[PDB]
């Protein structure tokens, strides 16, 4: 019981560390925000515009 | 009545085979069960729209990183299989 609870807590810690390692792995190749123009394209009208 | 179960690595891998060696076997089996559970639930949840699919990204999370979790867990599976061998 008490020893079983202690060893359960030990394995809980050694799985928490592995879960944190997994979080580090998933954040090792993150792409949260991608740089992109995300605005209007180029048409012939703006070519013939004074701009 | 005559099952005659016994108890350097020859006894070590038997102790691993033992379901309960207090400190060692409980850890060895609980952590593997956690790995298999997280693996199967990850394989399940990669289908729900909001989880990992273009089910809510058409308007604009769908982070394809559960593949890394699958790789890690199959790595655990194969290293454990090598240990069993």
From Swiss-Prot, chain A:
Tissues and organs where the protein is expressed, per its UniProt entry: Expressed predominantly in brain.
Superkingdom of origin organism: Eukaryota
PTM comment: N-glycosylated.
Transmembrane segments: 7-27
Compartments where found: Cell membrane
Function: Promotes cell surface expression of the potassium channel KCND2. Modulates the activity and gating characteristics of the potassium channel KCND2. Has no dipeptidyl aminopeptidase activity.
Subunit structure: Homodimer (in vitro). Interacts with KCND2. Identified in a complex with KCND2 and KCNIP2. Forms an octameric complex composed of four DPP6 subunits bound to the KCND2 tetramer. Interacts with KCND3; this interaction modulates the channel gating kinetics namely channel activation and inactivation kinetics and rate of recovery from inactivation.
Additional note from the record: Genetic variation in DPP6 may influence susceptibility to amyotrophic lateral sclerosis (ALS). ALS is a severely disabling and lethal disorder caused by progressive degeneration of motor neurons in the brain, spinal cord and brainstem.
Family of the protein in this entry: Belongs to the peptidase S9B family.
Reported disease: Familial paroxysmal ventricular fibrillation 2: A cardiac arrhythmia marked by fibrillary contractions of the ventricular muscle due to rapid repetitive excitation of myocardial fibers without coordinated contraction of the ventricle and by absence of atrial activity. Intellectual developmental disorder, autosomal dominant 33: A disorder characterized by significantly below average general intellectual functioning associated with impairments in adaptive behavior and manifested during the developmental period. MRD33 patients manifest microcephaly in addition to intellectual disability.
Entry protein name: A-type potassium channel modulatory protein DPP6
Residues of the full protein shown: 94 to 140 of 865
Swiss-Prot record, chain B:
Modifications the protein undergoes after translation, according to the UniProt entry: Phosphorylated by MAPK in response to signaling via the metabotropic glutamate receptor GRM5.
Domain of life: Eukaryota
Extracellular-facing ranges: 48-63
Expression sites (tissue/organ): Detected in ovary, in corpus luteum and in granulosa and theca cells in the follicle (at protein level). Highly expressed throughout the brain. Detected in amygdala, caudate nucleus, cerebellum, hippocampus, substantia nigra and thalamus. Expression is not detectable or very low in heart, kidney, liver, lung, pancreas and skeletal muscle. Not detectable in human heart atrium.
Subcellular locations according to the entry: Cell membrane; Cell projection, Dendrite; Synapse; Perikaryon
Transmembrane region(s): 26-47, 64-85
Associated clinical condition: KNCD2 mutations have been found in a family with autism and epilepsy and may play a role in disease pathogenesis. Autism is a complex multifactorial, pervasive developmental disorder characterized by impairments in reciprocal social interaction and communication, restricted and stereotyped patterns of interests and activities, and the presence of developmental abnormalities by 3 years of age.
Domain notes: The transmembrane segment S4 functions as a voltage-sensor and is characterized by a series of positively charged amino acids at every third position. Channel opening and closing is effected by a conformation change that affects the position and orientation of the voltage-sensor paddle formed by S3 and S4 within the membrane. A transmembrane electric field that is positive inside would push the positively charged S4 segment outwards, thereby opening the pore, while a field that is negative inside would pull the S4 segment inwards and close the pore. The N-terminal cytoplasmic region can mediate N-type inactivation by physically blocking the channel. This probably does not happen in vivo, where the N-terminal region mediates interaction with regulatory subunits, such as KCNIP1 and KCNIP2. The zinc binding sites in the N-terminal domain are important for tetramerization and assembly of a functional channel complex. The channel undergoes closed-state inactivation, where conformation changes lead to inactivation through an intermediate state involving breakdown of its 4-fold symmetry.
Family: Belongs to the potassium channel family. D (Shal) (TC 1.A.1.2) subfamily. Kv4.2/KCND2 sub-subfamily.
Its biological purpose: Voltage-gated potassium channel that mediates transmembrane potassium transport in excitable membranes, primarily in the brain. Mediates the major part of the dendritic A-type current I(SA) in brain neurons. This current is activated at membrane potentials that are below the threshold for action potentials.
